[PDB]
Amino acid sequence: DIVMTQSPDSLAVSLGERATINCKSSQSVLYSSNSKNYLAWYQQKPGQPPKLLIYWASTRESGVPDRFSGSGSGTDFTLTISSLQAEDVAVYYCQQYYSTPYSFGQGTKLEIK
Amino acid sequence: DIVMTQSPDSLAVSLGERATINCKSSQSVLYSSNSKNYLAWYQQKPGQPPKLLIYWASTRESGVPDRFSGSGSGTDFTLTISSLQAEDVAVYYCQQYYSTPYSFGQGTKLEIK
DSSP secondary structure letters along B43-102: EE-TTS--EEEEETTTEEPTT--TTEEEEEETTEEEEEE-S--GGG-EEEEEEE-SSSSP
Resolution, in Å, please? 2.7
* Euclidean distance between CA atoms B27 and B74, whole angstroms: 8
Domain of residue A92, residue span:
1-113
B9 CB neighbours in chain A (<8 A) are: 12-14, 113
Asked if A23 and A110 touch (Cβ cutoff 8 Å), the reply is no
Give the angle B71-B17-A92 at the CA atoms, nearest 5°: 90
β pairing state of B68-73 and B90-96: unpaired
Handedness of CA B52, B109, B77, B25 (dihedral sign): negative
* C-alpha dist (Å) from residue A38 to A55, A66, A94: 7, 20, 10
Supply φ then ψ for residue A62, to 5 degrees: -60, 140
* Euclidean distance between CA atoms A2 and A99, whole angstroms: 8
Query: Which of B12, B17, B20 is the closest to A10 by Cβ?
Result: B12
Residue A110 CB burial class (10 angstroms; 0-12, 13-18, ≥19): buried
The residues of B whose Cβ lies within 8 A of any Cβ of A are 5, 7-14, 17-20, 22, 113
Q: How many separate domains does chain B show?
A: 1
Q: CATH number for the domain including A10?
A: 2.60.40.10
